[PDB]
UniProtKB/TrEMBL annotation:
GO terms for biological process: antibiotic catabolic process. It comes from the Bacteria. It catalyses: a beta-lactam + H2O = a substituted beta-amino acid. This is beta-lactamase. Its cofactor is Zn(2+). Its main location: periplasm. It comes from Escherichia coli.
Amino acid sequence: DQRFGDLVFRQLAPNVWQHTSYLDMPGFGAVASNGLIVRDGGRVLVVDTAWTDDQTAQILNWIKQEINLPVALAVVTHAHQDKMGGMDALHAAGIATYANALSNQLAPQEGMVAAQHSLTFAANGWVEPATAPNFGPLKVFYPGPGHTSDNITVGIDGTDIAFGGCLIKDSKAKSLGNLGDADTEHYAASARAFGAAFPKASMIVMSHSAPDSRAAITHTARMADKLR
Ligand SMILES: C[C@@H](O)[C@@H](C(=O)O)[C@H]1CC(SCCNC=N)=C(C(=O)O)N1
Ligand SMILES: [Zn+2]
Ligand SMILES: [Zn+2]
């Protein structure tokens, strides 16, 4: 683990890093939020911002120092603060940002800054390639409504890594966390759909825990079963 400012960076694979930022919430303590950094050829790709614009700027600063390649694009997995909180930092730096069309539509109501481009998805959940230009190893999948109506997920092609965001919780988790915006009826099916979308992924990266095995997906699904 590497510390850079208030952020921590961990290499998960030769070309993949996890970024972690913290937000102190009064009465509840500091909460960690994870994202991904992917090196693809002569460019870098980001998945999710940090909690804030300042923290996100630090991600770009670490990238400059540790990777020294231009950041080509970023993808945010839904319209909540821990995933979209630092959109300004990305846009200030001239980085093209992509999100679920629904996330961009919800963003203003959520107090978030919308991404600059919209992803749309097929009936089977896979992104329509036309809306996801030059994503390299990033394979984006909409598993259906769960944590939120708009949550999307990301696999890293050519690695054992898949990113479930706030949809997937780790196998040690006691609850499904914040269900304030959740679709409790479809949550279980969506978690399982993600598992089926990336059947070979063995390392599951998520928003609020260290990377886990596929057990995180199944354990989440089974916790969600009880919500019905
Ligand atoms: C604060 C907001 O961004 C919230 C969300 O996205 O729903 C953050 C905080 C949280 S709570 C973190 C884990 N909580 C466990 N009780 C989650 C989450 O559950 O995914 N995401
Ligand atoms: Zn959320
Ligand atoms: Zn979260």
